[PDB]
Amino acid sequence: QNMMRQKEQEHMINWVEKRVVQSISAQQEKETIAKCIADLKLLSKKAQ
Amino acid sequence: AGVGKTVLIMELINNVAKAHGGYSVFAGVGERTREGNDLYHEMIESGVINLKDATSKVALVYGQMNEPPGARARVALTGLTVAEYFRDQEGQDVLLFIDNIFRFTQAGSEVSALLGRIPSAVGYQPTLATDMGTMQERITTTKKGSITSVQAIYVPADDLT
Amino acid sequence: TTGRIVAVIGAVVDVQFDEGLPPILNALEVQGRETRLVLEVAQHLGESTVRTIAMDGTEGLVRGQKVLDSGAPIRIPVGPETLGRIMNVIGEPIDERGPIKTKQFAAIHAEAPEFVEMSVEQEILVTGIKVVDLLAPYAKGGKIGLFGGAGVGKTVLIMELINNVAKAHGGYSVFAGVGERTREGNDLYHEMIESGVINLKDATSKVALVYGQMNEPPGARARVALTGLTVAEYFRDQEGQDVLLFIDNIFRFTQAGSEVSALLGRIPSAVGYQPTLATDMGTMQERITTTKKGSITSVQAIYVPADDLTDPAPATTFAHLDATTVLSRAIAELGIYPAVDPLDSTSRIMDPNIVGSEHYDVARGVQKILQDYKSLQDIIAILGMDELSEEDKLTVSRARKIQRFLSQPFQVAEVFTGHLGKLVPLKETIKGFQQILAGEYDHLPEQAFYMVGPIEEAVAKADKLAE
Amino acid sequence: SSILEERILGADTSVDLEETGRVLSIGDGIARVHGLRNVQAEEMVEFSSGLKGMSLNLEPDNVGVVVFGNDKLIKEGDIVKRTGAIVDVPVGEELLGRVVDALGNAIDGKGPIGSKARRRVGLKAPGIIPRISVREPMQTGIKAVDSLVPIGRGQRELIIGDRQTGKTSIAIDTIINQKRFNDGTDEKKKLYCIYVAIGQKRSTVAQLVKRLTDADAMKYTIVVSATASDAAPLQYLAPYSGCSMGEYFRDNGKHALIIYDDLSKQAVAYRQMSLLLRRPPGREAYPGDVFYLHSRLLERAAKMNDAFGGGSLTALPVIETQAGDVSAYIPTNVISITDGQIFLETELFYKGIRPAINVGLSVSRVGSAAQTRAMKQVAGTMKLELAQYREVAAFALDAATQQLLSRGVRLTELLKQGQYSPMAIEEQVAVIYAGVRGYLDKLEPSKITKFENAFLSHVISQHQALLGKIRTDGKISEESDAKLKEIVTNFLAGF
Amino acid sequence: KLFVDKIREYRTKRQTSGGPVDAGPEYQQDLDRELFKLKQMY
Amino acid sequence: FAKLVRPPVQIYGIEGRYATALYSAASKQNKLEQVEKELLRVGQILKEPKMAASLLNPYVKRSVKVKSLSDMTAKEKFSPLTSNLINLLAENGRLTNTPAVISAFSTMMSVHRGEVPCTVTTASALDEATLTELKTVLKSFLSKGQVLKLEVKIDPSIMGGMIVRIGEKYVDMSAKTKIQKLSRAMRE
């Protein structure tokens, strides 16, 4: 049971990663940049 | 020489390939070309190597004595790579003969000197311990198989220290 | 002034000043630490940069910290208020009893006494140790050295000397433990508290303690010796009183100097030692002298690395001592203790005009016979003693009796041996060795002499063995 | 499966403003970094590949950072992030029973280490006031070590000997024997063992952990393995990690025991680390620093007085000497740092006399102090008798001489022992009592082993009341002595 | 963001989990080898 | 010795020593701006194919180099500081690495007037509205007197997110490291 389940999980991660790498191929870059800039504002405010 | 080292090596190869089904690798580090050819032909005669019917029990790797030090310090790792395949991707036992194991440390020493590293105690490289460790520590019995290494040893100046 | 750290490699910190630099040997305080980290200047690299040796752990030093010049070298509290206290290199108390409240401070880098101040008077110091008294009589007011490998007796012997000499002394005393165990320092502290030598509730203490034990960075070990020399120089000069100064282990001074001399960018000398080994040792051992103002009796325990007396460190220190005492592992493996080697121990007062003629003649007869036996040992080890003349057999018997008789049981080694510690007066020692050489004891067995005080006990033990 | 998805969430993905530097040149295991303006010395910077390094040199224009892994995972141009803390390791009772590597990263499987406190590997030893003399006994469970060359709590013994003379075996028996104390009622006799494996084959440590788990001895042991393959800056650091995991107990009122195995293979890793920094080699190519390296490490095996918790940290460094040369460089460097020593001869070992302690040279400079009174009574006589036997064994006449020879041979046969077979203190007392008082001088020496075994199986079965009396009252009273004499005489009769 | 991305990636994988998804012959071969190793040691 | 005024930023190496000497020379007499002008003019001069090829040959006497450089520094009426600097470099033989020198000085001048450099990395270009809001936020990091000196850049390797460098500070908003962190968390 241990062997089969751990190998199952390893393959789980392998393909999940390989496919999220593909799924990053959308056109949401604007949202990511907006969130990053907001977090930059947060960091700047905190660091002074 | 003259004591039965090659015949003993061939017998170990044969028995382990016969009583266990596990193949063998022979990494001739710093191998005289004459001795390498003689070993090849002795094996062909003795059947451990066979040139016709794809049932050879030995994989020979030869780092000859006229190759730059950078190549005599790495042949042990080529032998270990072949044997590691036979252990992991075919899950069996393996023999790994290393003739010689002193020439491995000497080759490492020359490479380290060439790179320009302060020689250690008796001229050996500073990284002698870990150079030996990285190689010798891949010859182990994991949960898929095992590599059993038979390492011919030369003792310089009859000095065991 | 105010500089800023610009490099930190191991225990060597390179600092930069914009205004005037501090002269070499000054002390600098790293401003912004949770403790007191003193950097002592050692070089002037140029570009208003100096290279300093840190007297404490340099972990957590950010390139660009602020360093504040003190203006004077390391200055420690000296005076009669340091008696019974403990001190690190920079003079802080480390015994947890409040500050050392003295009036006057002393810089640890003073200069050696000038040639027109040296005293010349020589006089024997009686220690109660048979071999030391007989073959290498210690001189009162002169440097003394105990050369030993690792685990041979340097510290048990220096503790026996502490006991015998100091407890029977009138003047003050200083113990500068440099680069040695910390538990040994604690045991010594708690063993002088119980002897009344240190007093925690009065002003009748006689011993000052300074410690640079082996957990300390190289910077501290290389300077605690100077702190001890200063605390003793004060009692020598500003009191005009006889001081005793024990140092253990003085080889850590030079070893630490060499550990922190590869970083100073020097070309390493013979065996990796600093190029300045001899001069660094000289500028230290030349302040440990008896002069016309006082009298320091220094007992220094020198470590001999890897049991090599030709090593540069002991080889160099051999020239700064009046009396040497070479403890040897070969003897200690025979069970003889103290392991002193009779044919390597020397003294400058082994003169028939200083120790008399009977003492000198007995000592030289002992050495002659031991040397003859040593010469025989080469044959004896193969052809056995059955291949020697009769005079040679008799010589070997006497030599073995003498080798054993030199062994003595110390008071501080009761816990080891159980035997009772003995002081053998000098006359008893001379008499016993004179008798053994004459032949008055050729009938006793060797073991009758092993670990006994005066020869009366040897005769008594020989009687016990005969029943 | 959804367990893994919970594993996803709760991870810290928050981004922070962090100082950074750029690698300039990596090779020989020392990276050069550019930048890191506000980096402390001995700080722990982190490379982009998950590695770690200790900021070693703060030069004006760059930072020499020693990599704590394989420098093949570091480019030129990588990013080095400072983690703003001197090299730390996780400490706590959460590590007990875990095999953590030199940095506290569990190499065990068995989940991560759930530690809540961190120490500094580069701390300082306790001074002179906190320490107090060694008082309590550390029971090794080995007859020769417990009788002749005892050990205390706070002492730092040394185990020195050649290849394959049973040093790791002594260490493992000491670790196993503590099981009985670590089950009793009082937290004052519990010892929390640690075991640092430095430059040792990984299979050896795996089998050692398996053995310690067979003997139920992992409930308190921590194994800090920096094995042969691991980079030199990890074998150099492992002892300090272990010593910190032990200092935690020492400073929180508990008792710890740390076994460095070997320290002759940390000094070799340090010599590699140095010669690759171009530092000037010294005697045997070792740097002059190779003393401070061990002195600072072994000066932490202290014994804090009662005003400082009262804890303690015993240390058992294991040195290995080529051709049994006790006068080499490192052996003497360490013989002048430790409070004792146990010499394991390689010719006594080859005679089947195991463990091979060479009682002639072995010594413990706290010795009789911190020894159970019963063992003191029984074993002082053994020490004297063995001394006398040694004085004469150079030839093989009268009654006393032959008596010394026979008694010494009997005692030698009596002090042999088997692996993973520690003996309670009272059992050692009983055996050595039957040996020294003279209730064995007629039995043939060759049989002395069998007797021993049988005798134990008797005493443990029948007379456990007497053994409990000895254990509780740590002394052999007169009535106890008489009962024990009766037992020995009666048992010997039926033989 | 990426936390939600991982969440939805797992959702859309599990939904196509009528067993081991896109495994291949190596799946079965390795599993059989491991099982037979267990048999040999059990 | 004199008390050379320390430049704001510290550079190291031979380039840095010459640059620090020049900066302390110019700072006294308050000739920084013009000195930078003559430096960035010799930057163009030395790239001249004839001079570039002549100054790299080691077989022309050093005195020939110094004479030629005096000729080419008198024509442009360079401040005495720059002429002395170039003569010094020719004497010492370091003019082969003049571009490192003058470049260093440029850096050492930027830090003087507050141009705290920055750098932004992304997987695509940036809309001037987005870039302008980015500049406005980044300006909040600095202190008074300092002025941002942004430098856009593009890498394909990082999937999304963004990477920002502000002098020494460094924030990795990229999605590459986020993905790696998640993968480590869901493996370990």
Ligand SMILES: Nc1ncnc2c1ncn2[C@@H]1O[C@H](COP(=O)(O)OP(=O)(O)OP(=O)(O)O)[C@@H](O)[C@H]1O
């Ligand atoms: N008390 C003992 N009785 C019998 N055999 C022993 C004893 N102690 C050790 N041995 C045997 O000695 C061999 C090696 O011992 P051990 O590994 O403890 O020595 P070591 O010094 O640790 O070797 P190394 O240091 O090279 O690992 C083993 O086969 C072990 O069984």
Ligand SMILES: Nc1ncnc2c1ncn2[C@@H]1O[C@H](COP(=O)(O)OP(=O)(O)O)[C@@H](O)[C@H]1O
């Ligand atoms: N088991 C054996 N039976 C017969 N002859 C043997 C045996 N072992 C060794 N020999 C002889 O010893 C000689 C040693 O040669 P060999 O071992 O082949 O090369 P090397 O001397 O280089 O090891 C051989 O020629 C062989 O005839």
Ligand SMILES: Nc1ncnc2c1ncn2[C@@H]1O[C@H](COP(=O)(O)OP(=O)(O)O)[C@@H](O)[C@H]1O
């Ligand atoms: N006079 C003595 N009598 C008996 N044993 C001694 C004597 N001197 C030293 N020894 C033994 O030798 C060991 C050496 O220890 P010590 O002399 O304290 O350290 P060092 O290595 O600095 O000399 C002691 O622990 C002790 O067991």
Ligand SMILES: [Mg+2]
């Ligand atoms: Mg000592």
Ligand SMILES: [Mg+2]
């Ligand atoms: Mg071992």
